[PDB]
Amino acid sequence: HHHHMSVEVDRQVPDFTAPATGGDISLSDLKGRKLVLYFYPKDNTPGCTTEGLQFRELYPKFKKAGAEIIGVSRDSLRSHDNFKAKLELPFPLISDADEALCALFDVIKMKKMYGKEVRGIERSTFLIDADGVLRQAWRGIKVPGHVDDVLSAVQAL
């Protein structure tokens, strides 16, 4: 493939590798498990803290249903180590500082602040099955109710 391929529901997710808490993660590491890959704008903000804590609270149910959780933001590994420790998260955080995954999943959104454009992440989640296929996307979602919805989708696959 001589052109970049972005993710689409019903289609294979292109294989990727990225730095993470505890060491690097490749999509191929997740073969045979469901993967909830959740993108959040920024470590240590209120909404991203609540989202992480709610995935933490339901983590045993995700695991029982055959799924892993991975959070993604562009923050540094140092920030991720601190944020994971503060929230006692039982799952990894990918540091997408170079935007490879944000580009692949098409979550970048420019925001206008006082005549300046700011490069942001649109809070979005992707459910990838054990076969590596994108089964469901939630783009620009609000946090309340979201982890419940993702767990229901994981359980129904």
Complete domains list, the chain, with CATH: 1-157 (3.40.30.10)
Q: Which residues are catalytic?
A: 48
User: CA-CA distance, 54 to 145, in Å (whole number)?
Assistant: 10
**Resolution value, angstrom units:** 1.4
Supply the DSSP string of the chain, one letter for each residue. Answer: --S-----TTSBPPP-EE-BTTS-EEGGGGTTSEEEEEE-S-TTSHHHHHHHHHHHHHHHHHHHTTEEEEEEESS-HHHHHHHHHHHT-SS-EEE-TT-HHHHHHT-EEEEEETTEEEEEEPPEEEEE-TTSBEEEEEES--STTHHHHHHHHHHH-
* Structure-token pair, residue 136: 């469901």
User: CA-CA distance, 104 to 27, in Å (whole number)?
Assistant: 13
For residue 84, which of 102, 59, 63 has the smallest C-alpha distance? 59
Tell me whether strands 34-39 and 124-128 are parallel, antiparallel or unpaired. Answer: antiparallel
Q: 154 CB contacts (<8 Å, ≥6 apart)?
A: 34, 36, 62, 65, 66, 67, 127
